[PDB]
Design a protein around this motif. Structure first.
Motif, PDB file in Angstrom:
ATOM      1  N   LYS A  80      -2.686  -8.147   1.406  1.00 11.70           N
ATOM      2  CA  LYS A  80      -2.376  -9.564   1.317  1.00 11.70           C
ATOM      3  C   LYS A  80      -0.869  -9.747   1.200  1.00 11.70           C
ATOM      4  N   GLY A  81      -0.360 -10.831   1.777  1.00 11.43           N
ATOM      5  CA  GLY A  81       1.067 -11.066   1.755  1.00 11.43           C
ATOM      6  C   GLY A  81       1.568 -11.469   0.383  1.00 11.43           C
ATOM      7  N   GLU A  84      -0.676 -16.678   5.311  1.00 16.63           N
ATOM      8  CA  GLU A  84      -1.697 -16.254   4.520  1.00 16.63           C
ATOM      9  C   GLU A  84      -1.259 -16.351   2.968  1.00 16.63           C
TER      10      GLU A  84
END
Ligand SMILES: [Ca+2]
Ligand SMILES: [Ca+2]
Ligand SMILES: [Ca+2]
Ligand SMILES: [Ca+2]
Ligand SMILES: [Ca+2]
Lengths: 50, 377
Positions: free
Chosen positions: B10-11, B29
């Motif tokens: 995940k960013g 995201e």
């Protein structure tokens, strides 16, 4: 592997495209929406013998 | 940036989107929506636009990829909300409901008879219980006409001859004086006024009859060329304003020529003939037609058309008023109130292709009308 169906007494297929495209769609620009990934989709008679 | 494993998780808005190119996607995201991603991203190609505070007077700042968009408070225009917008009579009627003025780079609203201005500075006051200008397949010659709803046409004034057959329509001005056509008087030396007439034969009890006292008509009228056809007649008994009898708002001489008659549409009503060589009409009738330009008005008629004549109706749609409708109410529904515009005199036939019904300009006669009350009032 596409199942067959009897129309007019002759067997015919049923596979049908499903065009697709970026999701960045969500950011600026317009009809500039162009396509970028055609998935063909169909139907089988899947079995799991063993 | 967008390396392998990396994007297998995940960013993070510090990890990637700052020290890295932060193309997008990984910029999106972190929220997964539309609310913050656009605004946030807009500030990394060239910076944020709301840093500079470009808009004026608390004008909302909206960022963008190379521009700032301002959404100011009420009445503010311009690039940086620096322009303080001026309200004019052309610019939204100066916010006045009925009567506008352009007084010294501003608007100071007034009102007509029975109307005053409230503290808001723009909206009027319908002092009168019933203020003027408010609505208080069949064969056999119904020329697009509409039966007036109960109280929808309360300024309808009628002129009745000796033999109990009202002929000329009219707009109810007040309790004492009644406007009419100058040549409607040529029908007889004696006739009376009955107001509130909607169906002569079936009576509901809601009609008022007032005798004609003194004739106040036009001087320079022409009985052939139909120049200056207008008149005024007095009522012996006052009209107690009620649902079936309500006055019609009188505009001003300049105002009805700048805004009122520059609107597209109007309403035509009367009790004349439905069609050429036709019969009289008993049910109270009204019509809906628009106003058309002057450059096609001259080519229509066979008389001499002067500045006192204008054209209203259709070249195609065949719904036109006829003889006997002279003096009838020709009003226009303004922003919230009716104001009279025309007075019928004649017509080159009735419902002819390319022709228009002739109405005399009320505002060209409003200074005439207002003169009628302060000489023998
Ligand atoms: Ca991510
Ligand atoms: Ca850092
Ligand atoms: Ca990372
Ligand atoms: Ca990195
Ligand atoms: Ca990411």
């Amino acid at each position: 592997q596409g199942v067959m169906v009897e129309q007019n007494g002759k067997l015919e297929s049923q596979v049908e495209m499903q065009f697709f495209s970026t999701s960045v769609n969500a950011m600026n620009e317009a009809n500039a929406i162009q396509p970028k990934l055609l998935l063909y989709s169909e139907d089988v008679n899947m079995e799991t013998p063993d | 940036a967008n390396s392998f494993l990396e994007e297998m998780k995940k960013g993070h808005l510090e990890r990637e989107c700052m020290e890295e190119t932060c193309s997008y996607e990984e910029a999106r995201e972190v929220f997964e929506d539309s609310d913050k991603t656009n605004e946030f991203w807009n500030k990394y190609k060239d910076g944020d636009q709301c840093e500079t505070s470009p808009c004026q007077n608390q004008g909302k700042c909206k960022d963008g990829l190379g521009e700032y968009t301002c959404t100011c408070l009420e009445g503010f225009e311009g690039k940086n909300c620096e322009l303080f917008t001026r309200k004019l009579c052309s610019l939204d009627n100066g916010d006045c409901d009925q009567f506008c003025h352009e007084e010294q780079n501003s608007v100071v609203c007034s009102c007509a008879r029975g109307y005053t201005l409230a503290d808001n500075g723009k909206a009027c006051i319908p002092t009168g219980p019933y203020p003027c200008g408010k609505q208080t397949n069949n064969l056999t010659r119904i020329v697009g006409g509409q039966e007036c709803k109960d109280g929808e046409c309360p300024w309808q004034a009628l002129l009745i001859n000796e033999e109990n057959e009202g002929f000329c329509g009219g707009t109810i001005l007040s309790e004492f004086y009644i406007l009419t056509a100058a040549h409607c008087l040529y029908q007889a030396k004696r006739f009376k006024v009955r107001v509130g007439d909607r169906n002569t034969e079936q009576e509901e009890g809601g009609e008022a009859v007032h005798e004609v006292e003194v004739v106040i008509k036009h001087n320079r009228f022409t009985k052939e060329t139909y120049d200056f056809d207008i008149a005024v007649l007095r009522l012996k008994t006052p009209i107690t304003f009620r649902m079936n009898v309500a006055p019609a708002c009188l505009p001003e001489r300049d105002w009805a020529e700048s805004t009122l008659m520059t609107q597209k549409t109007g309403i035509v009503s009367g009790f004349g003939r439905t069609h050429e060589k036709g019969r009289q009409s008993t049910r109270l009738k009204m019509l809906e037609v628009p106003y058309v330009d002057r450059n096609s008005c001259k080519l229509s008629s066979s008389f001499i058309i002067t500045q006192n004549m204008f054209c209203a109706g259709y070249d195609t749609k065949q719904e036109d008023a006829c003889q006997g409708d002279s003096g009838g109410p020709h009003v226009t529904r303004f922003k919230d109130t009716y104001f009279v515009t025309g007075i019928v005199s004649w017509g080159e036939g009735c419902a002819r292709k390319g022709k228009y019904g002739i109405y005399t300009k009320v505002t060209a006669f409003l200074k005439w009308i207002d003169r009628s009350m302060k000489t023998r009032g």
